Enzyme design. Structure first.
Site, PDB file in Angstrom:
ATOM      1  N   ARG A  61     -21.511  -5.172  24.582  1.00  0.00           N
ATOM      2  CA  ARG A  61     -21.212  -6.058  23.466  1.00  0.00           C
ATOM      3  C   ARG A  61     -20.849  -7.453  23.929  1.00  0.00           C
ATOM      4  NH1 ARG A  61     -15.681  -7.111  21.258  1.00  0.00           N
ATOM      5  NH2 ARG A  61     -15.935  -8.051  19.180  1.00  0.00           N
ATOM      6  N   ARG A 108      -9.110 -21.049  13.576  1.00  0.00           N
ATOM      7  CA  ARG A 108      -8.503 -21.037  14.904  1.00  0.00           C
ATOM      8  C   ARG A 108      -7.446 -21.935  15.551  1.00  0.00           C
ATOM      9  NH1 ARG A 108      -8.996 -17.254  17.946  1.00  0.00           N
ATOM     10  NH2 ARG A 108     -10.758 -15.781  18.100  1.00  0.00           N
ATOM     11  N   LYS A 258     -19.197  -5.396  10.051  1.00  0.00           N
ATOM     12  CA  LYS A 258     -17.816  -5.180  10.461  1.00  0.00           C
ATOM     13  C   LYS A 258     -16.909  -5.263   9.237  1.00  0.00           C
ATOM     14  CE  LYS A 258     -16.404  -7.568  14.091  1.00  0.00           C
ATOM     15  NZ  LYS A 258     -16.331  -8.682  15.094  1.00  0.00           N
ATOM     16  N   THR A 316     -11.279  -1.741  18.670  1.00  0.00           N
ATOM     17  CA  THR A 316     -10.046  -2.490  18.879  1.00  0.00           C
ATOM     18  C   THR A 316      -8.732  -1.793  19.249  1.00  0.00           C
ATOM     19  OG1 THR A 316     -11.029  -4.059  17.364  1.00  0.00           O
ATOM     20  CG2 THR A 316      -8.689  -4.374  17.945  1.00  0.00           C
TER      21      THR A 316
END
Ligand SMILES: [K+]
Ligand SMILES: [K+]
Ligand SMILES: [K+]
Ligand SMILES: [Mn+2]
Ligand SMILES: [Mn+2]
Ligand SMILES: [Mn+2]
Lengths: 519, 519, 519
Positions: A61, A108, A258, A316
Site C-alpha cells: 500500500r 492539515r 474507505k 489501522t
C-alpha cells in the site's frame, strides 16, 4: 489430539464452540487472511521487501497522503523488483498487488515556526487562533495555527470542536471571526508540523476527488496499480467520481472505499453497492465518531460485506505498539484475532510497516494470529447463516460454490483448486468461507494480484501456454496447483482436495467439481 | 430510532445481528461490566481515589509483586477513606472492593550495577551468563545475569529459551553447566533491574504458595480484603493451599485463580471447580505460551466460566497505550469490547491505573466501551445457549433466575431487583445474563463488595434496621433499590422492573418474582 | 430409565429428538389435550355420561344438524346431571363444557322411496336426475334425487361435479335444465336418505346463519352453552353475524369458527382474528378440497392458532373405525398423535361417541394417545419459536407467562398453579406450551368450563367464599389446587410447582410467580 480447532467445529452452539477452543490444536500451514502492508522508509529497500514477501505481505500500500510521484514510483518499482526476484520458480512465486491510498479531503495545519522550541504546547484552557493566512503557513505556535482548509470558517460554528493531531488534541471555537477562528484548547498538549485535523460535527465541503487526487489516480492507472483505496468516500456519488477518473483505461482497477466518517457509515449500503470492496479505516473513523463505537461499525461493515460477497479490510493500529517494540500488546493480538473472526478478508499494517523498527516482526505476527483465528471460526454456523441470506439464485456458480465448500467440509479437503481467469468463480468460493485454502490458478496476472483481497484465495499465475486439447490444458493448470500445494506444505500425496473446473472451454464459470486425491 | 441495539437484538442469526449493530443506537445508563483498577503511585492519593470511584472503579487491586506491607496498608486505607467519603448518602453510595494480587512463583533477575536505573544492551549472538551465585546478586551487568530461582538449572535444557522483561528479551541455553547457564541472546536489547523472567517450556518447581505469599495472604485476612488474585495457580491443589492459608478466618474471602501458564490452561477445569472465580492474566500467559494463542485461551476460559456461573476477569494491557496518551488505540478499544462480548464479568486496568499519566481517562474509557458492547450482545442467543447448556438443575434459584431474566427480556424491564444476603440469588440471575441492571440490595456489606465480580450486579448496601413485619422490611429494601435506580438514571416513574424477593423470612432464596411499575 | 421423553427433550435437533423417542419412557398422569365428545343416542344416558367423564370427556358437543330443541335440551340436561353427580367432592370435581355445533348452510338429499328398505345403487355411467320438486322429497331412487338447496341450479353449471354422502358418491352435471339437473354418476354406489351433498367448485349462496340457525343460537343462549361451533363460516363477516345473534346476553359465549371449505381456508387469517377459536372440520374440508391436501390445511391452521394464542380443534374420523371395533387402526392412532404434536389444543370424536358401539373405549384411547404424544413434543424448540413470534413488544402478562413456563422447564415443575377469574392469565400460560399441567383455580364456573379449550389448563372450580384477607383467600385457592393435584396423582408432597397469583386483589392479572414445594 485434534487439529485446527476441529473438536470445537463440531459444537452445536457458540458457547460450546468457544468452550472448546484449544491452544494445543495446531492450525494449518495455509493462511487465508490477506495481509496488506503500507510501504515507507522502513520498508522501501528491495532487500527488505523480499523479506516482507517471505514473511507474508500480499499487498503493498502506497499512501499518497505524503510523498511525490517519483517517490511513489520508485517504491512501486522496488516492490515489483522484489516480487519478480522470485518469478523464476513457477511453484514458489507469490503474486503481490499494489494498492494506492488516496489523500482525499484532508485538513492539515502547517509547520511550526522554526524560531522556537521543537514542538508547541497547547495547554488546556489556553487560547489559540486558527488562521488561513498563508504567511503563517510555516510559523505555527501556541498562539497562531494555520490550516490548509480555506472554507473551514463557513462549516464550523461557535462551540464547534476541532481535533488536531489524531484527535489527541481538542479545540473549541469561541469566536467565529470572518476569515479566522479564535478557539480554546480543551484537550491535548503537544503540537507538531503538518498534523491531521478533524471537524467531527461539520460538513466539510472539500471535494471527494480533488485536483491532487485526480492526478494521483491518473498516475495509478499509468503505474498499473491493482487497486485504489479511496479516502473519506461518503456516498455512492463519490465512488462513481473515482470510477470515472480511473475511466476506461482503469476500468479493471478495483475501488476499495474507505469508511472513516459518520456520513460514510450512514450511507454504507449504497457505497458498498458502488464499490468493489470496503476498508474500515478505524483511524479517522475513531475520531469522526466516538472511539467506543468503532467496534460497532467494524463488525457491522465486515458483516454486510461478507453477506454481499465483497472484500473488506480492517485497518489501522492493529499492532501499533510494534512500531517501537518487537512483540505486540495483549490487546493488539486480540484485535487481529477478532478482526479475522469478525470475517475480515484482509488485515492491514500502516506505520508498523511504513516507518516502524520492526516491520518484519509485525507482518509475521499478523500471519501467526491469522492462521490461529481462522481455525477458531465457527464454519458450520457461518456457512449456514451465509447461505440462508443467499437470495434465490439464477447464478449457477453460487450453487457450485456452496456445494463445493460444503463438500470440502465433509471430507475435510486439504484445499479447493479453482481454474479461473476473471477470478469470479474463486471469489464465489471464498464468499462461502471454506476452511481449506482456495488455490486459484489463472493466466491473468492481474486477477491473481487482485485475488488477495479475497479471504482464502491463494493466487497461482500459470505461465504455460494454452494446450491444444482443453482436457490437457486443464490437467496442466490443476497439476500446477497440486504442485504449488505440495510445495507450500498445504497437502501431501494422498490427501483429498476438491477441484473446480470448466467442463468445456466455453463454460462461463466453474460448472465442474470433483473430489480428488492429490498424488 | 431504536435504543441499546434492540433492532439487532431481534435478529435470528449472528450475521444479521452484526449487520444490524448501529452506532446511533444509544446504550443505557447502567454499566454491567465490573472495572478492576490496579492502585499505584499514580492513584494512591485519597483525592484521586475519589475521582477513580466517580469515574467507574469497582475493585481496587493491590499488586503484591512489589511494595511492603505498610505500603499496601496505607493504600488500602486510602481507598476505604475515599470510599466512605460517600457513605453518608445511602442512595449514591457505591461500595468498593479491595483485592490482593499474589506474587506467586515469580522469577526475577537481580539488580544491575547495584543501582536502580539500569543499562546494558545485548542483541543477537551476544553470549550471556546466568549465574545462581548469590554473590553477583546485586551486580548484574552486560555479561552475567543473576536469577532468584535456584533450581533453574534442573528444569531447563540445552536449547531452551528464557524470556526476560516481559518477553521482550529472548535467550537460548547453549551450555548447561552445573549451577549456571551460558546462553545466547536471541531477541531483546536493553535490560533493567529486577525484571520478570519466564521459562515457557520448562516445569518450574517453585511453590504455589511461598513463604512470601503465606505472609501476604495472612496480611490480607488481617486487612480484611474481599478477594485474592492467586498468581500462577496451575492446579486444584494450588487453589486449596491458598484456601487453607486463608483458613477459617478468611473462609469468606473469594479466591480468583489467575491462569497464566500452559499448565493452568490445561488443568483449567479442575482449577475452576476449586476457585470462586478466574482471571485471564494475558500478560504472563502471552509469554508462557505463544502470543497468537492467547485469544483462544481467553475465549475458552470466559466461555467455560460463563457456563459454570463463576466470575471471570480479563486483564493486562487492555488500554495499555493510555499510560502515556489520553486516548486509546483502535486495537485497545476493540480489545475491551470483545472482552465484554466474549462474556467477561470484569475487565481490568493495571498500569494504565497504577502508574500511568491518565488513570482517570482510562477507567472512563472502559466504562464507555463496556456499556456500548454490553448492548451489542446477542442476548436471545446467549440465553438460549446458556440454558440449552445448563445440564441438570434442581437448584430452584436456577429456575427462578432463568424465568426472571426471560421475563425481563419480554417486557424490556429497566432492571431486576434482588434482595439477598449471601448474594447467591443475585449471582444466579447474573449468570443468565439479563440485559438490564441487577440491583442487589443486601445488609451484608461484604457480599455487596464481592458482588462486583458478577456481570450486571449493582450492589446496594441497606443500613436500615430489620423491620418487625417481613412485608414491610421487604418493601423497604425494594424502595431503596427503586430509589437508587431513579437516582442513577436507570429508570423513571412508570418503567417496569422485575423484583425477586423471598416469600417468607425463612425462604432459602428468592422464590418470589414480580413484574412491577417503579413509581 | 427416564420419564416422559425427557432424554429426547434434551436433543438439539428435530432429527435427534425423534431418534430419541422411547416407548419405555412413561408419560405423566396429567393429560393436557382437551377431549371433545359428540353426544348422541350412544351416549345420552346419564349413566353413560358419568362414565364418559371418568374416561376423559371435557366437552359435550350437541350437533344441531339433527334433532329438535327438546331433544338437545334433554341431552344437555343429562350431561349436566352426570357432571353434578360429582360436584359433592370439590377436589375430584371435573367441570364439563357444553358446546353447540351449528347446522349452517348444509345441503341434504331426500328420503329414498319406500321399497323394501333396499337402499339405492348408483352404478357408474348412469343418469340420475336431481329435482327440487318437493314431491320427490320422500321418494328418491336410482332415477330421481331431491335436494333441499333451492338455488342449486343458479350456482352450478354443465360439467360441475356434485358430491353425495361424504363425497363417497360423485355426479357430473350434463344438462343444466331449468329447475332441475340431469347428471351422470362418476363415483359412488349406494345412496341412503338425507345424505350430505357438496358442491366443491361452486359458490353456495345459502345464508351463513339461516332461520334454523338464528333460533338454535338463541336457544344456546337460553340453555347457557359455553361455546358455539359455527359451521361453514367462510369470512370475518360470518363470524360477526354469529357474534351479533348471540348478542349481548351471549357475549361470553366463545365462538369457534369451523374451517371446512376452500374459502374459509383462504380467508383464515381474518376469521381467526374475529373468532375465539378454530375447528379444523376435516370432514367437509376433505370433500370441499382435495383429500390429499387436508393435512396441509390442518397443520397450517393449528400452526397459526398456536402463534395467535387461540384454541384450535382437530376433528372428524380420528378414531373412525372404532365405531364398530374395540381397537383403533394404526393410522387412526397415528392421526391422534400427530394432531397433538401438530399442536392442537383439543381433539374431537363425533360418531365414535355419538352413535358407535365403543364410545367409552374411544375416549379412553384418545386419552392414552394424548399423554403419550404430549410428552413426545419438542418443548425446548417449540417454546423458543413461540417466543419469537411474540416480539419484545409487551402487554405484560405474557412476560409472566413466558417466564413462568421457562421456569417450569428448568426445575421440571410438576404443574403450574394459576388463580384467575376471567381465565386470561392461564390462557397466556397455556399459549407458551409448558410440559406440566396448568391447574387453574377460579370461582367463575364458566371460565372453568371454557378453560378446556386450552391445551394444558386443568380447571378447578372454587366454591369457598372470598376471605377477608387477600393473602388468606390466595393461600386458600392455592391449597385447593395443591389438593386437587395430590388427588389426581399429578404430584406428591415435596415436588415443585410454580404458582402464579396476583400481588394485591386489584391486580389485573397474575403478576406474582413463585417456585414452591407442594407439601
Ligand atoms: K491516505
Ligand atoms: K502479582
Ligand atoms: K353441525
Ligand atoms: Mn484516513
Ligand atoms: Mn502475572
Ligand atoms: Mn361440517
Amino acid at each position: 489430539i485434534q487439529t485446527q480447532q476441529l473438536h470445537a467445529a463440531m459444537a452445536d452452539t457458540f458457547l460450546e464452540h468457544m468452550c472448546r477452543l484449544d491452544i494445543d490444536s495446531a492450525p494449518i500451514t495455509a493462511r487465508n487472511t490477506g495481509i496488506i502492508c503500507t510501504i515507507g522508509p522502513a520498508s522501501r529497500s528491495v532487500e527488505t521487501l523480499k523479506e516482507m514477501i517471505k514473511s507474508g505481505m500480499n499487498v503493498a500500500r502506497m499512501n499518497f497522503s505524503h510523498g511525490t510521484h517519483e517517490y511513489h514510483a520508485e517504491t512501486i518499482k522496488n516492490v515489483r523488483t522484489a516480487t519478480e526476484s522470485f518469478a523464476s520458480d513457477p511453484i514458489l512465486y507469490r503474486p503481490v498487488a499494489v494498492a494506492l491510498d488516496t489523500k482525499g479531503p484532508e485538513i492539515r495545519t502547517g509547520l511550526i515556526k522554526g524560531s522556537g522550541t521543537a514542538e508547541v504546547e497547547l495547554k488546556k484552557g489556553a487560547t489559540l487562533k486558527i488562521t488561513l493566512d498563508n504567511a503563517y503557513m510555516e510559523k505555527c505556535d501556541e498562539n497562531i495555527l494555520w490550516l490548509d482548509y480555506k472554507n473551514i470558517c463557513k462549516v464550523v460554528d461557535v462551540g464547534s470542536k476541532v481535533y488536531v493531531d489524531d484527535g489527541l488534541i481538542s479545540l473549541q471555537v469561541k469566536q467565529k471571526g470572518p476569515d479566522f477562528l479564535v478557539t480554546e484548547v480543551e484537550n491535548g498538549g503537544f503540537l507538531g508540523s503538518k498534523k491531521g485535523v478533524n471537524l467531527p460535527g461539520a460538513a466539510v465541503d472539500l471535494p471527494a476527488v480533488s485536483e491532487k487526487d485526480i492526478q494521483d489516480l491518473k498516475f495509478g492507472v499509468e503505474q498499473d496499480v491493482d487497486m485504489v483505496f479511496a479516502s473519506f468516500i461518503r456516498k455512492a456519488a463519490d465512488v462513481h467520481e473515482v470510477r470515472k477518473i480511473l475511466g476506461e483505461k482503469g476500468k479493471n482497477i478495483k475501488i476499495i472505499s474507505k469508511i472513516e466518517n459518520h456520513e460514510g457509515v450512514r450511507r454504507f449500503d449504497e457505497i458498498l453497492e458502488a464499490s468493489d470492496g470496503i476498508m474500515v479505516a478505524r483511524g479517522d473513523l475513531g475520531i469522526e465518531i466516538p472511539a467506543e463505537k468503532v467496534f460497532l461499525a467494524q463488525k457491522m461493515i465486515i458483516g454486510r460485506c461478507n453477506r454481499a460477497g465483497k472484500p473488506v479490510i480492517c485497518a489501522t493500529q492493529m499492532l501499533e505498539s510494534m512500531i517501537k517494540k518487537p512483540r505486540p500488546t495483549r490487546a493488539e493480538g486480540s484485535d487481529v484475532a477478532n478482526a479475522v473472526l469478525d470475517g475480515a478478508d484482509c488485515i492491514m499494517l500502516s506505520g508498523e510497516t511504513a516507518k516502524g523498527d520492526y516491520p518484519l516482526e509485525a507482518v509475521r505476527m499478523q500471519h501467526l494470529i491469522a492462521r490461529e483465528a481462522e481455525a477458531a471460526m465457527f464454519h458450520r454456523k457461518l456457512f449456514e447463516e451465509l447461505a440462508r441470506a443467499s437470495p434465490h439464485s439464477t447464478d449457477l456458480m453460487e450453487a457450485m460454490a456452496m456445494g463445493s465448500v460444503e463438500a470440502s467440509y465433509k471430507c475435510l479437503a486439504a484445499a479447493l483448486i479453482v481454474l479461473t481467469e476473471s477470478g469470479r468463480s474463486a471469489h464465489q468460493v471464498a464468499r462461502y468461507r471454506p476452511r481449506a485454502p482456495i488455490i486459484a490458478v489463472t493466466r491473468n496476472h492481474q486477477t491473481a494480484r487482485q485475488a488477495h483481497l479475497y479471504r482464502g484465495i491463494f493466487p497461482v499465475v500459470c505461465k504455460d501456454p494454452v494446450q491444444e486439447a482443453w482436457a490437457e490444458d486443464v490437467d496442466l493448470r490443476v497439476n500446477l496447483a497440486m504442485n504449488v500445494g505440495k510445495a507450500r506444505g498445504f497437502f501431501k500425496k494422498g490427501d483429498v482436495v476438491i477441484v473446480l473446473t470448466g467442463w468445456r472451454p466455453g463454460s462461463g464459470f466453474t460448472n465442474t467439481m470433483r473430489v480428488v486425491p492429490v498424488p
